[PDB]
Every structure is written in C-alpha cells, then in structure tokens.
Design an enzyme around this catalytic site. Structure first.
Site, PDB file in Angstrom:
ATOM      1  N   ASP A 138      -1.698 -32.928 -56.948  1.00 21.28           N
ATOM      2  CA  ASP A 138      -1.120 -32.117 -55.899  1.00 21.28           C
ATOM      3  C   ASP A 138      -1.728 -30.763 -56.274  1.00 21.28           C
ATOM      4  O   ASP A 138      -2.189 -30.576 -57.401  1.00 21.28           O
ATOM      5  CB  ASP A 138       0.412 -32.103 -55.950  1.00 21.28           C
ATOM      6  N   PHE A 139      -1.734 -29.833 -55.335  1.00 21.95           N
ATOM      7  CA  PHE A 139      -2.363 -28.515 -55.521  1.00 21.95           C
ATOM      8  C   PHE A 139      -1.427 -27.419 -56.030  1.00 21.95           C
ATOM      9  O   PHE A 139      -1.532 -27.021 -57.193  1.00 21.95           O
ATOM     10  CB  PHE A 139      -3.006 -28.077 -54.182  1.00 21.95           C
ATOM     11  N   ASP A 140      -0.502 -26.964 -55.176  1.00 25.96           N
ATOM     12  CA  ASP A 140       0.389 -25.862 -55.565  1.00 25.96           C
ATOM     13  C   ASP A 140       1.244 -26.144 -56.791  1.00 25.96           C
ATOM     14  O   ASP A 140       1.958 -27.134 -56.843  1.00 25.96           O
ATOM     15  CB  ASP A 140       1.271 -25.483 -54.366  1.00 25.96           C
ATOM     16  N   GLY A 162       0.107 -30.117 -49.263  1.00 25.68           N
ATOM     17  CA  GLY A 162       0.813 -29.771 -48.035  1.00 25.68           C
ATOM     18  C   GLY A 162       0.545 -28.301 -47.696  1.00 25.68           C
ATOM     19  O   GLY A 162       1.142 -27.759 -46.773  1.00 25.68           O
ATOM     20  N   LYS A 210       1.060 -38.087 -48.088  1.00 25.04           N
ATOM     21  CA  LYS A 210       0.223 -38.148 -49.269  1.00 25.04           C
ATOM     22  C   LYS A 210      -0.070 -39.576 -49.704  1.00 25.04           C
ATOM     23  O   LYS A 210      -1.172 -39.873 -50.158  1.00 25.04           O
ATOM     24  CB  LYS A 210       0.839 -37.331 -50.402  1.00 25.04           C
ATOM     25  N   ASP A 235       5.439 -35.205 -53.041  1.00 21.11           N
ATOM     26  CA  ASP A 235       4.550 -36.083 -53.816  1.00 21.11           C
ATOM     27  C   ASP A 235       5.201 -37.452 -53.995  1.00 21.11           C
ATOM     28  O   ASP A 235       4.590 -38.350 -54.558  1.00 21.11           O
ATOM     29  CB  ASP A 235       4.236 -35.463 -55.180  1.00 21.11           C
TER      30      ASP A 235
HETATM   31 MG    MG Z   1       3.359 -28.700 -55.782  1.00 12.96          MG
END
Ligand code: MG
Length: 209
Positions: A9-11, A98, A142, A169
């Site tokens: 996941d990114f953030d 997201g 996802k 997630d």
């Molecule tokens: Mg995150």
C-alpha cells in the site's frame, strides 16, 4: 523458478506520509482532513465516501500547491533496500493506493516499481475541481487489482504477499498468500498473518521467500 509478487500500500507504508493530508495542509484544512483519514483507515467510514468528502475540501487548490505537498513525500525507512532485495529474490513489485496517481507515479518511477495503481484527482484550468475518480475506491478494489496483476504475470495467488496498514487493504489481504500488517490499524492487524511494529520496511524480508 516460480514467479512471485509483492504488493504494497502507498500512504504510511511505502512512503512516510499521508498524501491527502499533505495536500490538505496546502488548502488550509490539514486538521479536518487528517481526522477523516484516520477514521477511514480505522474502518469507521466507507472508503469511497470518505475520499470524496476529503477531496471536496480541496476544491480550487492550485496545481502548484498540490505539487508543493507532493514534493514532501518521502520513502519509508528501508524502502529502497527492501525493493532491491525483493527484486533479487525474484519478485514483481507493485504499489496499490487509494491515493492519487500524481503522487504514486513519482514513486513508481523513483523506486522502479513494476506496477502502480491509484485514483485520480480531477483538475481543470490548473486547479483541483474537488472531484476524484478511479478504480481503487470500492471495498474490494485492492484485492481485484492484486488478482489482475497476478493473472497478467502468471503468478499463483499462493505466491503473492501483501503489505498493508489500513482498512482499505483488507481486500488485498483477502486475496494474498501472505498478509503482512506494517505498523497497522487494529482492523487490519486482526486479519494479518504477520504484524510488524518496527517502522523499517527491511523488517519484512525475514518472512519473504
Ligand atoms: Mg496506508
């Protein structure tokens, strides 16, 4: 021998920051947006509605201010070393967020990721319109993307690993072979196979392969 896939996941996972909260700071609404982001990540709000509500608060923000915020985004401790070792172990490496392409694409290029999926901030005349669109909005988004990437690559889902930290997630975990919660919210930790609490991405390597 057999190809493997790892999705991040990114953030707050691949990068230290929460993209939307940094942009909100430029729009003068950091406090307000941070609260919604936290609630969404804890699983207390529907993700899509929470994202649209936050983006609405960014209406009219100039693109130059969005870029100022994005330039502050930095990779989490151990990111580059972890990606290099994953590639050496035979992994395809992907990021699913997201968040927004304008931010995620930069990191895709910087870190040399094989795949990147994110939502899109709508812009007109050099200013955000207050809308967002994308395919990482629905609750199962996802997981669907994990399946699509694994199919393109001919990788069995049992040979996939998901590294996440928030409520959005959960669907990624549902489809993954190995589920790693990285400094994560309770709702995701409860679904995890492994919970890491030291903020260093290299900590996942011992469980990989
Ligand atoms: Mg995150």
């Amino acid at each position: 021998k057999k190809k493997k896939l790892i999705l991040f996941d990114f953030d707050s996972t691949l990068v230290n920051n929460e993209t939307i909260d940094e942009i909100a700071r430029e729009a003068g609404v950091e406090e307000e947006v941070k609260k919604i982001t936290k609630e969404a990540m804890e699983g207390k709000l529907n993700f899509e509605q929470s994202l649209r509500k936050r983006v609405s608060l960014l209406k009219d923000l100039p693109i130059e201010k969005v870029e100022k915020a994005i330039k502050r985004i930095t990779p989490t401790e151990g990111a580059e070393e972890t990606i290099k070792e994953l590639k050496n172990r035979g992994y395809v490496v992907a990021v699913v967020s997201g968040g927004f392409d304008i931010a995620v694409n930069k990191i895709k290029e910087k870190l040399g990721l094989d795949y990147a999926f994110a939502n899109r901030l709508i812009v007109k005349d050099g200013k955000l319109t207050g809308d967002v669109e994308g395919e990482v909005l629905k609750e199962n988004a996802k997981g669907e993307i994990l399946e699509k990437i694994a199919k393109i690559e001919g990788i069995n889902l049992e040979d996939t690993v998901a590294v996440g930290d928030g409520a959005n997630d959960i669907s990624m975990f549902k489809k993954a072979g190995l589920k790693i919660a990285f400094c994560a919210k309770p709702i995701l930790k409860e679904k995890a196979d492994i919970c890491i609490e030291k903020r260093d991405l290299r900590e996942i390597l011992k469980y990989i392969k």
